[PDB]
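Researcher: Next entry: Protein SNI1 (Saccharomyces cerevisiae).
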Amino acid sequence: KNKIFSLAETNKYGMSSKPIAAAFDFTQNLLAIATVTGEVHIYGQQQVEVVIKLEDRSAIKEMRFVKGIYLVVINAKDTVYVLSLYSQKVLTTVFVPGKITSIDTDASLDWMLIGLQNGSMIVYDIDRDQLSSFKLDNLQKSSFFPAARLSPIVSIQWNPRDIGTVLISYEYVTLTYSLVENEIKQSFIYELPPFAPGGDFSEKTNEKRTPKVIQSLYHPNSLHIITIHEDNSLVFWDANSGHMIMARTVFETEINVPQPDYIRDSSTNAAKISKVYWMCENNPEYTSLLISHKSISRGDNQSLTMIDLGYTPRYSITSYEGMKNYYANPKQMKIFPLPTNVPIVNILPIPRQSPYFAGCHNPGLILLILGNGEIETMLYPSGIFTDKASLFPQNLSWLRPLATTSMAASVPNKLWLGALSAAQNKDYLLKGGVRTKRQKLPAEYGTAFITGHSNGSVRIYDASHGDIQDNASFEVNLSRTLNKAKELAVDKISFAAETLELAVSIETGDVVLFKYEVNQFFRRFSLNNTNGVLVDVRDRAPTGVRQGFMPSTAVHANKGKTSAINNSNIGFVGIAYAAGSLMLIDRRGPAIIYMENIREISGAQSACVTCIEFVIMEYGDDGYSSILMVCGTDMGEVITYKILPASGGKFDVQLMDITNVTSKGPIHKIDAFSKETKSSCLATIPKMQNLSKGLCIPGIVLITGFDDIRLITLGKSKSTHKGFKYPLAATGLSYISTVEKNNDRKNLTVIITLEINGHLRVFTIPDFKEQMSEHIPFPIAAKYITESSVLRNGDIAIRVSEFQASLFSTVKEQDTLAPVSDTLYINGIRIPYRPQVNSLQWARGTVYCTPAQLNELLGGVNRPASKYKESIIAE
Ligand code: NA
Ligand SMILES: [Zn+2]
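Model: Predicted structure:
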């Protein structure tokens, strides 16, 4: 009933599925990340983010930004899509005649080279949506190995300084090809004589070998090239003479020389090479190689290796031996240990100097997408990994690193907005696009989101995209507060919205308290230093932050993991431990005012308290309101405590009673409302101050069990209950206002419920008359569904999966403005001049070719004008 309620999704957070591939455009300075189900997220400065969903739900293999206005996306079905960063829609879909095994594009060119399984190479005109007549047959079969198996094209790359030359690798031969002269310029075939050790994974060292090629790359100067093979061999060649300069691996050289008495001196089990990147610094004369390794076993066997080659000797005055010396004695080699044992699925360097040199021009950061969906960021060349949420839009923080817990709360905008105004994100990395202003009409309450991570970090921000809320956020790190590096996974979180206080529990059982406030402005700190349970960590506050969530106390009970926590809005914090202990702390102090193991009080077989809540209402029938701490146990028991203002501003704790309320344990949600006004009875400072008035407010407490809800009156026996067909995921009370008369404001208190399978319901209380019944529109993960939070205005924040959350509204009538999108493409940004062959490095030998001339070669003299408005715009 009630035309008042209607289910609608208001917002999405994180990603609807696992990230699988990424790309970056230097010119527009935008980051694109694609998922396993065909969605493409494009990010820019601050919170700029646009999502484009492909018709096909197939996974994305590769993406490239071209001409600064197009995004080329290729899915698993070898279907090529071309997206417009100008109109934010798909411009064309193309099915490729064959299996795509390699490609290459260039930010300044309209052409994409495509290698196929059959070893052929075709060229596609991205700008005019047409295939070129230019096609290459399998050169390996026709010119080098006719009797060999039909080889596919393993890799293709545009010559860094000459758009008219391309580097092509087949399995057993690599070669440079001139599109202008239409002929093979040079070839390179890596052969090992008998007794040559070869790469770490080389087999039958006794015979002659031609180890398959897995990748080919041009040296930034374009005069040398490297070929990497299956045995892990790294071979450097002079691109013009074809002379093989030197063959080596990460640990040795002269691997091409026969050594019948060779013995592998390695205390490190080899890791097969996955991919290689040739980087260069601001000044192209300095370069380095970044190498990734496919794991063996399954334990952190995925580290990155960097070989800094330093200054490249001048080509014209360096002998082959000089060059061999250059490659044999790197300026430096360092291994970058990956924080995780999870396999890397995609590596993307983030260029800082220009879009050239295959997008590796002075990258100060490397983006990594892991098989589990986590996204890592490693500073280059330092190798320092960072999880600073502030570096990218907040929606990406759900991935860096994955959230282990989360919640949402209705917070009063009064002080909330003041805190956000002073917390704008001023140090994000991306610069592209413009965030479209989406001003949200004022409200007394806003929505705060809070996430915990395996990292030990906790992110805090507003779920809205308003002027002040959109780009504001806070991040607190327990690794600092605790001077710890392992065992930091956030287990539970409690956020007191009225006093902006925070309680964080970690996997060890320790709990740290924080509070939004002004800040005070050793390396030996350890919780085990003192014998006290309350450890002062006030001085462990973040250095340069004038204000924010500052730490105060660390709770070191040494009582195991927590079973429940609740930072009240009245200075008290309740903490329960799986082992049975129950603790009550008064922030005024701070001090522990109560601590007993509830197992010695249970009438049932209660092992621990599974839920804690603070209320101010009449206990039983004593005629006045009291401060009551209500606790639900894993066995359906409810324990009620009275918190009484005592002498010297302290408080006494009095156990009122323990009652076995339901066989549907455990109790995981507690709430309350007044019997007459049906307004919230959760404890608040103003309510606490009113105690001196001696008012009496009888109320009803809601006890949420496994699959049943109990309505009870504290201190009384009578009650009611409502059972559900499916287990309950989350419940909560909502307070709504409905106009109807002439300007009459009639409020309504409803309870909203979410079952673990995704079904959502709204009921009026205490009669429990259903007002709405609908299922969430998509599959939801049982694992995270229980983190969901019902909000004060009828909204509900739901965690759908490991990387996704959605905000839903249940109240139909709402002040909704038509959806709007951010701007991605910015006009007038000039794409720099591509590097050219240094007449100073290799004078002559090259054949200058302008893009105009390349366009004629590949497109023909009568190349049509494109049908895209984007073609002319991009000039
Ligand atoms: Na926001
Ligand atoms: Zn349903």
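Model: Note for the record: Residues 461-462, 464-465, 469-470 surround sodium ion (ligand 1) (CB under 6 Å).
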